[PDB]
Amino acid sequence: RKLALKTIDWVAFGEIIPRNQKAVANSLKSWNETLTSRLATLPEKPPAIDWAYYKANVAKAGLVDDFEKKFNALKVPIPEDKYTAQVDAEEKEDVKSCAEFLTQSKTRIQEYEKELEKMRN
Amino acid sequence: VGLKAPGIIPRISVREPMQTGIKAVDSLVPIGRGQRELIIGDRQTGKTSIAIDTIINQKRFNDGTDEKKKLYCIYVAIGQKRSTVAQLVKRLTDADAMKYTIVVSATASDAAPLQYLAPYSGCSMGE
Amino acid sequence: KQVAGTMKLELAQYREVAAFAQFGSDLDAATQQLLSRGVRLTELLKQGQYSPMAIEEQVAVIYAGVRGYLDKLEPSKITKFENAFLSHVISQHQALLGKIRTDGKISEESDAKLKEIVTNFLAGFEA
Amino acid sequence: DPAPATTFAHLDATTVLSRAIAELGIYPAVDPLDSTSRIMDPNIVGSEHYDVARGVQKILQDYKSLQDIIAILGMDELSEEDKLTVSRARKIQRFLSQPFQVAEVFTGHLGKLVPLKETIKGFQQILAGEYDHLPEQAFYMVGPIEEAVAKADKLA
Amino acid sequence: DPAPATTFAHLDATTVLSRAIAELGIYPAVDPLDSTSRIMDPNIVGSEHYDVARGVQKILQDYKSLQDIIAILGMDELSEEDKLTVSRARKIQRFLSQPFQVAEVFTGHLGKLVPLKETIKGFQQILAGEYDHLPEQAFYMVGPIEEAVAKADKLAE
Amino acid sequence: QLEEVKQASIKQIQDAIDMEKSQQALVQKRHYLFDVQRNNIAMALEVTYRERLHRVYR
Amino acid sequence: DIKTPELIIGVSSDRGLCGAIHSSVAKQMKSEAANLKEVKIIGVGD
């Protein structure tokens, strides 16, 4: 693991015209920050083991080898995705925003500015 | 140990800072190196802590490759029971700042001259 | 030196303003600010048990308060902020950190880098 | 006295029973700004403890600062928040008063023993000022905070 | 302490620097109402000096008396004539403060020095209560009084 | 006369501003929100796999 | 007798270092203050 990245956007937070999440985003960013700091903290890697020399200094040297093989050959799986609708249940609710609220909002605007012109006249 | 202090001439006064990571310290009673400064206070206020964190702090400097900030740390423990000391050692260990560190330890135990001597010892070692 | 001179001074009054026209309770904004600020600075220097740090960071955060930028907030959030601010800068303004460390000083530019950064960080702290 | 002075070095937990406090009648008679434990740490025993304490230690510490000015002045023309807090500090003090099961003969009072949580809770609550609409003495010789509550009723 | 006590005998001019005053931050940090020369004179230092000093010393001493009210009973607050003196003393104090001339390295204050008459005079003006329209901090850490006047101006911003 | 002139002037630009400010925000900030969280999600897991490879070997 | 469905003002001294005069008024103005429309208060003394 390894995971990529989007910066704070406070404008975003407030707006969520899916009302059922309005609070959540404020809290959810702060949950994020928990991860953000936590990841920035740690490195990815320990070292490894020179089993040859440790076998020299372990008289039960079989052990070093056995655990060596199992460990070094082993790879444990990255904590696995369960959710990826985020992108989606957004970008669709972002259309929800645009088309649905874009159109209605832009069409309203036009009438306003249309009467003003003649009101400047 | 009994080697006496040098003269005037083999010195050059300070003009380096010395840093502890302790904001207050470094700021307000800003310290340099070669100096002498009293830590004065009562008991386990992290009595020690003060030193420790500083030392740990020097770790990054010791992780520097300086010798302007790469600071070899010397800890004289006078009268400090082994347990305390143990913890202490351990703390450094944990911090492993110990690698650039002597810990001269005359714990609580030690027949009196021993505690007495230790500083001087540390001193020679530091000179 | 750049923040601290002033700060020391400021604290001096701040501490002082506990004694003239106060032994413990009274009011006026000008001065209240000084207190507020002061209180903040207190936090800002308030560095709990266990804390090795690097000076520019320290300055970094210090700068925020000195340059009056959080006065607003409560102490409680300072620390939190400070931390937060730290990963932020650490990460991002690692650039900047590079610089400040380098210059041994904060250049005016680096300052500016702070100014927006901090403001923004604060803002980010919201916003 | 040098003897104790030395001793401290060897301590790890210090129990200062405090006669002043004792004079305040209290058994418990400790003064924990004195009675300190190296092993009292945000570390070793939680910060909650520490902090809840730090507020307490603080408040008390401040209070300790205050009593003397107050000694003259009372707290009368001295800020109410302080008044509150002082009283609270004290309440907390009182709340620390704890009966002795062994010395029920001595105390009259019947021992109390309080597991940690209720301990935390207690202070956190008092600290919350939640309790505070209450009598100081309610906090006296309690067991858990409930008992103070119980007692509050019993008072008022 | 017996030793200094003895020492005193030998001394004919004593500078007792007051750490409290030092704690009051000053530099002039001195004890002033203790820093003497038995050899101050209305003749030899002339009476002007002498008197000025004595008056001053007095006022400071007086001021000290006023301290007694103020710590617990008011600090921009009580009676006012005394205020007048308080402030005056305070100015005097500030004026008594003079920059350090090498610890400009530390302070950034260029040290100052004032030969005697301008000084005596100096205080006399203050004594004359001239600068009362003028306020305190302008007086701090100066050499001659003008510099304080100047400082006032800088301060009016 | 002059009153009505300004009354429509206010109301008209008012609805121009507020609607156009609504429009611009929603795209970016919602775009915002999606990528931010993804961020957060993904990060965690990076660490969590890794840390462990340490923890274990230790 | 007079009435209104509707100048809450208290009177205090300028200075303390006297009783609970202040405390009282301080209290009792506020003690009121919730109840009433045109909530506005005037303080004589300080």
From chain C residues 44-73, the ones with a CB under 8 A of any chain B CB are: 44-45, 47, 49-55, 58, 62
CATH class of the structural domain E40-157: mainly alpha
By what technique were these coordinates determined?
Answer: cryo-EM
Instruction: Please give the residue range of the domain that contains residue C101.
Output: 1-127
Minimum-distance CB partner of F27 among A97, A108, A116 = A97
Residue B1 in tokens? 């140990």
Tokens of B22: 């302790």
Q: Which two three-digit tokens encode residue D49?
A: 């403890």
Distinct helix (H) and strand (E) counts, chain B:
4, 2
Q: How far apart are the first and last CA of chain D?
A: 47
Q: Is F36:A8 a contact under the CB 8 Å cutoff?
A: yes
Cβ distance B21 to C55 less than 8 Å, yes or no, reads: yes
Q: How far is C107 from chain B (nearest CA, A)?
A: 19
Helix or strand run (H / E) with residue C14: helix C4-16
The DSSP symbol for B31 reads B
The resolution in Å comes to: 7.4
Q: Which residues lie below 8 Å from residue A111, measured CB to CB, with a gap of 6+?
A: none
Contact partners for chain G, using 3 or more CB pairs closer than 8 A, are D
Q: Is some CB atom of chain A closer than 8 A to the CB atom of F17?
A: no
Strand partners for B75: B103
How many residues are present in chain C? Answer: 127
Beta-bridge mates of residue E13: E37
| Chain A residues lying within 8 Å of C83, measured CB to CB | 37
Tell me which H or E stretch contains F3.
helix F2-57
- List of chains touching E (3+ CB pairs within 8 A): C
Number of domains comprising chain C: 1
- Secondary structure class of B103 (helix, strand, coil): strand
C21, burial (CB in 10 Å: exposed 0-12, middle 13-18, buried 19+): middle
Strand-pair category, B73-78 with B101-106: parallel
- Chain centroid to Cα E78, Å, comes to 23
Q: Establish, for the pair of chains A and C, how many residue pairs have beta carbons separated by less than 8 Å.
A: 14
The b-or-e profile of B32-53 (16+ CB within 10 A means b, else e) is: eeeeeeeeeeeebebbbbbbbb
Contact G17 D77 (CB under 8 A): yes
Q: Does C76 touch chain D if contact means CB atoms closer than 8 Å?
A: no
| Number of residues written out for chain D | 156
State how far residue F28 is from chain A, nearest Cα, in angstroms: 7
Strands E13-14 and G8-11, by their bridges, are: unpaired
Q: Which helix (H) or strand (E) holds F49?
A: helix F2-57
- Residues of chain D neighbouring C24 (CB-CB closer than 8 A): 66, 69, 78-79, 82
8 Å CB contact between C36 and D90:
no
φ/ψ of F19, rounded to 5, equals -75, -40
Provide the token pair at A62: 């079989």
Residue pair F40/A36 in contact (Cβ under 8 Å)? The answer is yes
CATH number of the domain that residue C24 is part of: 1.20.150.20
Residue B115, token pair as written in the block: 């505690």
Beta-carbon separation of E71 and C23 below 8 A: yes
Domain D40-156, CATH: 1.10.1140.10
Whether the upstream peptide bond of residue A77 has omega within 30° of 0, thus cis, is: no
Chains with 3 or more CB pairs under 8 A to chain F = A
User: How far apart (Å, rounded) are the C-alpha atoms in residues C123 and D2?
Assistant: 55
d(CA E70, CA D25): 37
**Helix, strand or coil for residue B76?**
strand
Q: Shortest CB distance from C4 goes to which of B22, B28, B58? A: B28
Provide the sign of the torsion angle of the four alpha carbons B6, B9, B15, B16, taken in this order: negative
The 3 state secondary structure assigned to D11-63 is: CCCCCCECHHHHHCCCCCCECCCCCCCCCCCCCCCCHHHHHHHHHHHHHHHHH
Q: Do residues E138 and E149 touch, judged by C-beta distance below 8 A?
A: yes
DSSP state of E110: P
**DSSP assignment of A54-77:** HHHH-TTTHHHHHHHHHHHH--PP
Query: Per-residue b/e over A89-104, b at no fewer than 16 CB within 10 Å?
Result: ebeebbebbeeebbee
**Using the beta-carbon criterion (under 8 Å), do B22 and C62 form an inter-chain contact?**
no
Contact E/B (≥3 CB pairs under 8 Å): no
Q: Is B23–C8 a contact, with Cβ atoms under 8 angstroms apart?
A: no
Report the residue of chain A nearest C123, measured CA to CA: A10
CA of C89 vs chain A CAs: smallest distance (Å): 11
For residue A69, the tally of other CB atoms under 10 A from its CB is: 10
Looking at the DSSP assignment, which residues form a beta bridge with residue B73?
A: B101
Cβ atoms of A1 and A43 closer than 8 Å: no
Tell me which H or E stretch contains G43. strand G41-44
> Strands B73-78, G8-11: parallel, antiparallel or unpaired by DSSP?
unpaired
User: What CA–CA distance (Å, rounded) separates C87 from C77?
Assistant: 15
User: Of all helices (H) and strands (E), which one includes residue A114?
Assistant: helix A86-119
Chosen for mutation from E69, E72, E76 (greatest number of chain C CBs closer than 10 Å) is: E76
| Separation between Cα atoms, residue A46 and residue E127, nearest integer Å | 76
∠ CA G14-G20-G22 to the nearest 5 degrees? 35
Give the distance from residue C16's alpha carbon to the nearest chain E alpha carbon, in angstroms: 9
Q: How many CA atoms lie within 13 A of D29 on its CB side?
A: 10
CA dihedral E144, E148, E149, E155 (to 10 degrees): 160
Q: CA–CA distance from E58 to each of B49, D118, D124, E51 (Å)?
A: 50, 63, 56, 10
Q: How far is A51 from F10, CA to CA, in rounded Å?
A: 81
**CA F12 – CA A115 distance, rounded (Å):** 7
Strands G41-44 and G8-11: parallel
Å from C87 to nearest chain E CA?
A: 34
Query: Cα separation of F54 and A48, whole Å?
Result: 9
Task: Output the CA–CA distances (angstroms, integers) from residue F9 to A109, A114, D61, F1, F3, in the order listed.
Answer: 13, 11, 64, 13, 10
Q: How far apart are CA C77 and CA D47, in angstroms?
A: 17
Alpha helices in chain E (DSSP H): 2-10, 19-23, 46-73, 81-96, 104-107, 116-127, 145-155
Q: Verify whether the Cβ–Cβ distance A32 to F36 is below 8 Å.
A: yes
> Does any CB of chain A come closer than 8 Å to the CB of residue C122?
no
3+ Cβ–Cβ pairs closer than 8 Å linking A and E: no
Alpha-helical (H) ranges within chain B are 23-28, 49-62, 82-94, 112-126
User: Which residue in B has a C-alpha nearest to residue D13's C-alpha?
Assistant: B44
Task: Check: CB of residue A12 under 8 Å from CB of residue F32.
Answer: yes
Would an 8 Å CB–CB cutoff place C49 in contact with chain D?
yes
Token representation of residue E66: 């006023």
Is D42 in Cβ contact with C25 (below 8 Å)? no
Q: Which residue of F has its CA nearest to A67?
A: F57
- The answer to whether the Cβ–Cβ distance between E76 and C12 falls below 8 Å is no
CA distance E144 to E126: 12
Q: How far apart are CA D17 and CA D34, in angstroms?
A: 9
C23 CB neighbours in chain E (<8 A) are: 71-72
**What does the alpha-carbon distance between residue B53 and residue B38 come to, in Å, rounded to a whole number?**
16
Separation CA E52–CA B92 (nearest Å): 63
* Separation CA C92–CA C12 (nearest Å): 34
Cβ(C43)–Cβ(C75) below 8 Å: yes
Q: How far apart are CA D99 and CA D143, in angstroms?
A: 7
Nearest Cα to Cα of residue C4 among C85, C47, C58, C69: C58
Determine contact: C94 vs chain A, CB below 8 A. no
Backbone angles phi, psi at E48, to 5 degrees: -65, -55
- Binding site membership of B for ATP: which residues? 44, 46-49
CB C62 within 8 A of CB C33: no
B36 interface with D at CB cutoff 8 Å = no
How far apart are the C-alpha atoms of B95 and B98, rounded to whole Å?
7
Which chains sit next to A, with 3 or more Cβ pairs under 8 A? C, F
CA distance A89 to A108: 27
Q: How far apart are CA B45 and CA B56, in angstroms?
A: 17
Q: What is the 3-state secondary structure (H, E, C) of E44-72?
A: CCHHHHHHHHHHHHHHHHHHHHHHHHHHH
Phi, psi angles (nearest 5°) of residue C19: -90, -45
Q: How many CB atoms lie within 10 A of CB D31?
A: 19
Find out whether F58 and A45 touch, Cβ atoms under 8 Å. no
Residue D76 DSSP label: T
Is B touching C (3+ C-beta pairs, cut-off 8 A)? yes
Given CB atoms, is E71 within the 8 Å cutoff of chain C?
Answer: yes
The set of residues, in sequence order, having a beta carbon less than 8 Å from that of E79 and lying 6+ positions away, is none
Determine the straight-line distance between the first and last CA of chain A, rounded to whole angstroms.
64
Q: Write out the DSSP string of C52-109.
A: ---HHHHHHHHHHHHT-SSTTS-HHHHHHHHHHHHHHHHHTTHHHHHHHHHHTS--HH
Is C53 close to B21, i.e. CB distance below 8 A?
Answer: yes
Q: Which residue of A has its CA nearest to C88?
A: A37
Do the chains contact at C84 and A10, CB–CB below 8 Å? no
